[PDB]
Write an enzyme that holds these catalytic residues in place. Structure first.
Site, short mmCIF file in Angstrom:
data_model
loop_
_atom_site.label_atom_id
_atom_site.label_comp_id
_atom_site.label_asym_id
_atom_site.label_seq_id
_atom_site.Cartn_x
_atom_site.Cartn_y
_atom_site.Cartn_z
N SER A 208 -6.62 -22.27 -0.45
CA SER A 208 -7.74 -21.60 -0.36
C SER A 208 -8.46 -21.08 -1.63
O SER A 208 -7.82 -20.93 -2.73
CB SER A 208 -7.11 -20.32 0.36
OG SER A 208 -7.99 -19.12 0.09
N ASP B 113 3.68 -24.37 17.28
CA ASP B 113 3.94 -24.43 16.09
C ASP B 113 3.61 -25.43 15.12
O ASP B 113 4.31 -26.42 14.84
CB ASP B 113 5.71 -24.07 15.88
CG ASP B 113 6.10 -23.58 14.55
OD1 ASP B 113 5.21 -23.43 13.78
OD2 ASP B 113 7.38 -23.89 14.20
#
Length: 330
Positions: free
Chosen positions: A199, A35
């Site tokens: 992004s 994770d």
């Protein structure tokens, strides 16, 4: 030194990925969920409440000659989905795909919430976010990656998740045969303890690319892609019959639909998520309503590039002094 381990989807929908990890001497192999959104290595153990263990492989520190109780240390963690776990802490030898760390904090679960008990294939979690997010008190502990870093040929790990197929987690090296083209690297902010990046935009199907900054985290421990309401609405508007359902808890679409692809930007590069990766099957067995792989981050407070997005790419988690994230097509 380096490590290389295979990661396998726990089910037909890629709900989570498990990677075998060796703990203690003689080795005890547990299937952990790697994770990059948390920093605790915690396992189901002989100390876990017997009514909260349902088929998991447990770590038994009494059977390990290298196990040592980290006297007084406790951990308590709760995740974005509302699940939680807590307990005491041992140190022990931990190996991932041949890469060994001695004296790694192995947080032994005393209590786990129902979601963990229900996942019989997941024996625990291996946290790979920044060690600043580790919950061990009073002495904060380092992740497996933090502890291995100085022994690593290169201070990096890569995530190469498969779509309905197994994948690979590599430590210390970059496999030049696992991707096509070049790796595009992007800045990481460690301020929130996550692999947080920006992004450069998105596209829906064969539509024009929209240049817009989308701050988010690269999170292998989150199944879906969580983006702002504006972006998620523009995607689902292209699927006939798709709607946001409060009873189901997100966007659903007619199982008869063929989903468009979703492209996200990494600098001047583009990562395309095929439409098939966004299909999470019927909401209930036999239902004609299917669950969407792209959901709104509105209720979370952070955008999450989960497995839906990460499996469309070869992802480099560069843990150098100035941490960066690399994305390549594959």
């Amino acid at each position: 030194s380096t490590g290389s381990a295979t990661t396998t989807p726990i089910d037909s929908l890629d709900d989570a990925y498990i990677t075998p990890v060796q703990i203690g001497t003689p080795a005890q192999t547990l299937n952990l969920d790697f994770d990059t959104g948390s920093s605790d290595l915690w396992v189901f153990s002989s100390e876990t409440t017997a009514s909260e263990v349902d088929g998991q492989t447990i770590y038994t520190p009494s059977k390990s000659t290298t196990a040592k109780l980290l006297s007084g240390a406790t951990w308590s963690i709760s995740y974005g989905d509302g699940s939680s776990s807590s307990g005491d802490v041992y140190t022990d030898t931990v190996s991932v795909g041949g890469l060994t760390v001695t004296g790694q904090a192995v947080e032994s679960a005393k209590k786990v919430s129902s979601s963990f008990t229900e996942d019989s294939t997941i024996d625990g979690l291996l946290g790979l976010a920044f060690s600043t997010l580790n919950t061990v008190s009073p002495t904060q502990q380092k992740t497996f990656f933090d502890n291995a870093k100085a022994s690593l040929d290169s201070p990096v790990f890569t995530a190469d998740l498969g779509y309905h197929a197994p994948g690979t987690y590599n430590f210390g090296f970059i496999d030049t045969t696992a991707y096509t083209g070049s790796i595009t690297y992007t800045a990481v902010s460690t301020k929130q303890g996550f692999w947080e990046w920006t992004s450069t935009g998105y596209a829906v199907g064969s539509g024009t690319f929209k240049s817009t900054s989308i701050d988010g985290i690269a999170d292998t421990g989150t199944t879906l892609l969580y983006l702002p309401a504006t972006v998620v609405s523009a995607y689902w508007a292209q699927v006939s019959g798709a709607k946001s359902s409060s009873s189901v808890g997100g966007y659903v679409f007619p199982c008869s639909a063929t989903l468009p692809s979703f492209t996200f930007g990494v600098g001047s590069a583009r990562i395309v998520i095929p439409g098939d990766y966004i299909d999470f099957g019927p909401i209930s067995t036999g239902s004609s309503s299917c669950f969407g792989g792209i959901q709104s981050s509105a209720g979370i407070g952070i955008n999450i590039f989960g497995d839906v997005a990460l499996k469309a790419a070869f992802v480099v988690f560069n843990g150098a002094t100035t941490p960066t994230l690399g994305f390549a097509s594959k």
